[PDB]
Amino acid sequence: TDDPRLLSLFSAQREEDADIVIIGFPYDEGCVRNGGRAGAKKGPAAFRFFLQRLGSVNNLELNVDASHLKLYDAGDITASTLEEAHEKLESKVFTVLARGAFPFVIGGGNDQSAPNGRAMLRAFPGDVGVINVDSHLDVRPPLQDGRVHSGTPFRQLLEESSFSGKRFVEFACQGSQCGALHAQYVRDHQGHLMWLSEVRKKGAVAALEDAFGLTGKNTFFSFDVDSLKSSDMPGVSCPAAVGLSAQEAFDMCFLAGKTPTVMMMDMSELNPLVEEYRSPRVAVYMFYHFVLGFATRP
Numbered sequence: 001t002d003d004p005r006l007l008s009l010f011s012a013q014r015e016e017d018a019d020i021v022i023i024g025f026p027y028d029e030g031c032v033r034n035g036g037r038a039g040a041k042k043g044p045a046a047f048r049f050f051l052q053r054l055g056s057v058n059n060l061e062l063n064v065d066a067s068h069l070k071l072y073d074a075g076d077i078t079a080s081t082l083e084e085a086h087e088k089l090e091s092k093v094f095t096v097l098a099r100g101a102f103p104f105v106i107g108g109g110n111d112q113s114a115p116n117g118r119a120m121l122r123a124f125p126g127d128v129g130v131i132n133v134d135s136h137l138d139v140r141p142p143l144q145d146g147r148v149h150s151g152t153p154f155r156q157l158l159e160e161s162s163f164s165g166k167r168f169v170e171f172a173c174q175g176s177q178c179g180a181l182h183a184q185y186v187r188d189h190q191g192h193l194m195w196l197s198e199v200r201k202k203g204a205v206a207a208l209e210d211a212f213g214l215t216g217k218n219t220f221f222s223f224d225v226d227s228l229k230s231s232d233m234p235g236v237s238c239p240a241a242v243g244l245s246a247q248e249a250f251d252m253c254f255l256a257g258k259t260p261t262v263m264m265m266d267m268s269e270l271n272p273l274v275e276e277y278r279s280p281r282v283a284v285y286m287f288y289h290f291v292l293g294f295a296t297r298p
């Protein structure tokens with residue numbers, strides 16, 4: 001064609017030949033357990049639909065040519081329970097990290113972020129940083145029988161002995177959604193809360209630069225799309241009245257892509273049952289901006 005897009009970068013015949021490996025996590029039981037609306041299990045299929053259609057690989061507005069990057073779709077994690085699904089996701093992500101490639105995980109519920117974090121902690125012993133981009137802090141306690149959910153993943157990570165809380169950042173969190181007890185929990189573990197209002201004051205990219213300074217080496221960039229305002233991103237499990245704009249999200253993902261300390265990324269809560277067209281496009285354009293950033297990464 002006279003207009004190659006992301007689809008054209010899937011030139012890797014073998015997974016090991018790819019710079020970036022996409023892994024799908026089509027599960028939303030974690031959401032329903034956390035009192036949310038089902039539908040995020042369709043996130044990966046919606047994302048793939050527009051992945052085949054969008055994103056100029058040579059972008060003359062930003063002056064980035066991503067045509068040399070190689071992408072690979074590893075398919076979906078397949079399991080008969082949510083817990084086996086988490087184990088398989090953890091193991092797959094680890095293999096990608098272990099050979100120095102970049103895993104990008106498309107959800108699915110935010111519960112995926114726990115196994116992703118464990119893969120990081122094993123790949124980079126005692127030397128991991130984590131940013132959680134979410135309107136919520138996601139440090140809720142499990143259900144009565146020990147059942148984890150879309151609101152517990154960073155409580156699980158902060159309880160890891162090898163993980164330093166000083167290298168944990170809650171980014172674009174919202175006071176109206178987040179309990180004093182849960183903020184306290186993060187603060188008492190030495191984590192950092194960069195509230196939406198603080199992010200706005202500084203500018204999203206500037207604020208994310210500061211966050212990457214605190215997370216340091218071997219950073220997991222964990223992007224929950226319900227951190228975006230629902231005017232731009234309605235199709236998520238918990239739609240936000242206020243939040244990050246699409247452009248802020250794009251600029252943040254570009255920064256993540258270009259920052260050589262960011263070693264993996266996930267994207268949670270995309271919910272096509274809530275809204276099926278505009279929202280998956282935003283999600284794909286977020287990934288696209290990461291890809292452009294990655295093309296420039298020193």
Ligand SMILES: [Cl-]
Nearest residue numbers: 229242243244
């Ligand atoms: Cl807003």
